[PDB]
Design a protein around this ligand. Structure first.
Ligand SMILES: C[C@]12CCc3c(ccc4cc(O)ccc34)[C@@H]1CCC2=O
Ligand SMILES: C[C@]12CCc3c(ccc4cc(O)ccc34)[C@@H]1CCC2=O
Lengths: 126, 126
């Protein structure tokens, strides 16, 4: 919980950039060795870098996916933040957009220790 | 964890409407009797309707606080949702805005069991 509120905003905005460019390896480097991801929130967690890498490779490696912040990063003083963003993709030739909110907790080294993504079919658009 | 994702979106949007009008009575009844609120996230939890009512009583006090959703409510399938919104008030003279993200978990009765508000000074503008 060492990153400042300002640092958290920057780290979170960076993450979106890496997702937008699709640099799978740079995204995985942002996560702690033992990070846990819940995406979508409510599903069993993804534990560790190896499994976390598989998620991003499978989700971003495929077609063309774009991601943009749709509002400012809300940052707390205990190394946590939440951000609203939109993910654009094509599903079976159908152009789609998914609205998502990610909540992240960072460790003392500025690495993502926990990530939870809030979204469901209700957040899907065309 | 029983309201559907569509129900969560409705409940959360209603909450913003009540905050906007300042209906402190209706807000408190949205909460479970032993609910917990962490606002701002990082600060110690306020528990139970009495304490929660005090928060809204003093925060929305006079009636010069406006609140509006600034994007869709993201809802999961386990009774949780997260939403982006802006609060407008006055800092002893000059009008300012605060960008916040609320994450809420609902119970089998459609009542807010837990609420966490993400924000800090980095989200305050004049
Ligand atoms: C995996 C995915 C692309 C990336 C992505 C999704 C959902 C939530 C995300 C949250 C992130 O923080 C980063 C990327 C995604 C989509 C779900 C459907 C899809 O194609
Ligand atoms: C209390 C407050 C007005 C309402 C409000 C604030 C912060 C987080 C909130 C979260 C809510 O879910 C509902 C209302 C607020 C502001 C903090 C400074 C202020 O004037």
């Amino acid at each position: 919980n060492l990153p400042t509120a300002q640092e958290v905003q920057g780290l979170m905005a960076r993450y979106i950039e890496l997702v937008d460019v699709g640099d799978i390896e740079a995204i995985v480097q942002m996560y702690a060795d033992d990070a846990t991801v819940e995406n979508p929130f409510g599903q069993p967690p993804i534990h560790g870098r190896e499994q976390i890498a598989a998620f991003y490779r499978q989700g971003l490696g495929g077609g063309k996916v774009r991601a943009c912040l749709t509002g400012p990063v809300r940052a707390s003083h205990n190394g946590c933040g939440a951000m609203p963003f939109r993910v654009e993709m094509v599903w079976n030739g159908q152009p789609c957009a998914l609205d998502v909110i990610d909540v992240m907790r960072f460790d003392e080294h500025g690495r993502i220790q926990t990530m939870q993504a809030y979204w469901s079919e209700v957040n899907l658009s065309v």
